[PDB]
């Protein structure tokens, strides 16, 4: 599979939601489109935190890794 | 002399649902319709096994209302209106 960063960007682009994709929607998309290991949920949670701190993702709902995200 | 075991299904899902409705239940999960009829037969076995031994001690062949009333009374479930 590609980097979790790219898988998260692809998930948010695939799911054309007005609010962006939730952590749960991103988790569902990645598990259905890519061969990910058992650690996927932890790697997605970590990658979302990093992408929000780097400014690649804008938080629309919730706080931290919980909630919904859009591409900046 | 030929009663089978299917009569437990006689207590239907709508009957149990309306019993719960009287009991004040809003909504019922599907697994309850088996648990409740499991409970009911346990209750009835306990009561009937005491009614029938009363009748045996009275050397009778029929089960009277007073036998059931006594059986319920000895379980701390006294019932009014039948004697």
């Amino acid at each position: 599979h590609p980097k979790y960063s790219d898988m998260i960007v692809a998930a948010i682009q695939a799911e054309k939601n007005r609010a962006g994709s939730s952590r749960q929607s991103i988790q569902k998309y990645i598990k259905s489109h890519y061969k990910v290991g058992e650690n996927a949920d932890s790697q997605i949670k970590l990658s979302i935190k990093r992408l929000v701190t780097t400014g690649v993702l804008c938080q629309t709902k919730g706080v931290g890794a919980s909630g919904s995200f859009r591409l900046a | 002399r030929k009663v089978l075991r299917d009569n437990i299904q006689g207590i239907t899902k709508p009957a149990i649902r309306r019993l719960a409705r009287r009991g004040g239940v809003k909504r019922i999960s599907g697994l309850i319709y088996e648990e409740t009829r499991g409970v009911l037969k346990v209750f009835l076995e306990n009561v009937i096994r005491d009614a029938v031994t009363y009748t045996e001690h009275a050397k009778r062949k029929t089960v009277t209302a007073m036998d059931v009333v006594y059986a319920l009374k000895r379980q701390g479930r006294t019932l009014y209106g039948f004697g």
Binding site: - | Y80, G81, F82
Partner: protein, 94 residues
């Protein structure tokens, strides 16, 4: 032709004393009979146990006062004892 006894007459008289113009269904009368029998058995059994505990052989009003105090709760027991003592006093006054 075995004549059986109940408390229907007395229940009806008390009903007429309390509500002069109210009837009672036949099935409700049986419920009242069962209630009367149940309370009678409770009180008499309690009095018998008191008499046996205190090595007596007589059930008097003294035992029934205690039995009522044990069985009935609170203000109901207070009023019941008040009613019972008054009736015993009137009975002995005559």
């Amino acid at each position: 032709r075995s004549r059986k006894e109940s408390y229907s007459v007395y229940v009806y008289k008390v009903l007429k004393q309390v509500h002069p113009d109210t009837g009672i269904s036949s099935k409700a009368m049986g419920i009242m009979n069962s209630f009367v029998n149940d309370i009678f058995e409770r009180i008499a059994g309690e009095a018998s146990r008191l008499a046996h505990y205190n090595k007596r052989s007589t059930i008097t009003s003294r035992e029934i006062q205690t039995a009522v105090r044990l069985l009935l709760p609170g203000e109901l027991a207070k009023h019941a004892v008040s009613e019972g003592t008054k009736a015993v006093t009137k009975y002995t006054s005559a």
